[PDB]
């Protein structure tokens, strides 16, 4: 696998270059929002983001080396986590708000729209706040997002291959931290801090999948066949 041969700088550059674009929401309807219009906008956006996510994933070093079936499994497991860490990342410099798209910035008041989205809203806000206070860097973020892709489905399954790549990304995170000037103690301390946030991102995704499942049954908005398939995998 070519991924293990990459240097840390090469890994970073590859992950940065693989980044998907930031998509816009439909420009209609606009604020204010109903539960139907809110979910309609978010569903439409998420569906288009998924297509870019799939092309992003095939560009994460090590991912192409997996069988098609293993690729499907990882994306099925991690897709909402990946959308969420993305959301939290681009919401960082908008404290107290969630930047779903550049033309769709929301506060928790609009979260009561379709309860219990307010609970998940607050969790997302808290994560963004934590990233901001930690001064999370773009290079660190792309490492974390790739870790989510490779790790989230790995125990629901060579698994050794995935773990070697994960080690490589750990090496890369430390490498980024060291050249940011952090001491040895600060290095492993921030590594731990970041990885523990991933358990919260998992928690948010789990609660989120439940919600999307309830929405499916409530049939408030027609879901795409792709989103249904991504969702059905968690039933």
């Amino acid at each position: 696998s070519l991924a293990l041969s990459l240097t840390a700088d090469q890994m970073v550059s590859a992950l940065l270059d693989a980044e998907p674009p930031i998509l816009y929401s439909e420009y209609d309807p606009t604020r204010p929002f109903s539960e139907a219009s809110m979910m309609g906008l978010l569903t439409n956006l998420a569906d288009r983001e998924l297509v870019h996510m799939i092309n992003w994933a095939k560009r994460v070093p090590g991912f192409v080396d997996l069988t098609l079936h293993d690729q499907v499994h990882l994306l099925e497991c991690a897709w909402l986590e990946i959308l969420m860490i993305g959301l939290v990342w681009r919401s960082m410099e908008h404290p107290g708000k969630l930047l779903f798209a550049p033309n769709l910035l929301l506060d928790r008041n609009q979260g009561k729209c379709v309860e219990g989205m307010v609970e998940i809203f607050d969790m997302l806000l808290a994560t963004s706040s934590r990233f901001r206070m930690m001064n999370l860097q773009g290079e660190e973020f792309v490492c974390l997002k790739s870790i989510i892709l490779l790790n989230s489905g790995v125990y629901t399954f060579e698994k050794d291959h995935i773990h070697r790549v994960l080690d490589k990304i750990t090496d890369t995170l430390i490498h980024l931290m060291a050249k940011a000037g952090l001491t040895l103690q600060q290095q492993h301390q921030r590594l731990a801090q970041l990885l523990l946030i991933l358990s919260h991102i998992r928690h948010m995704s789990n609660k989120g999948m439940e919600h999307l499942y309830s929405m499916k049954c409530k049939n408030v908005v027609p879901l795409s066949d792709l989103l249904l398939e991504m969702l059905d995998a968690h039933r």
Partner: peptide, 10 residues
């Protein structure tokens, strides 16, 4: 089958 497969292959 799954749309995801198709999106992955191309």
């Amino acid at each position: 089958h799954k749309i995801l497969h198709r999106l992955l292959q191309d």
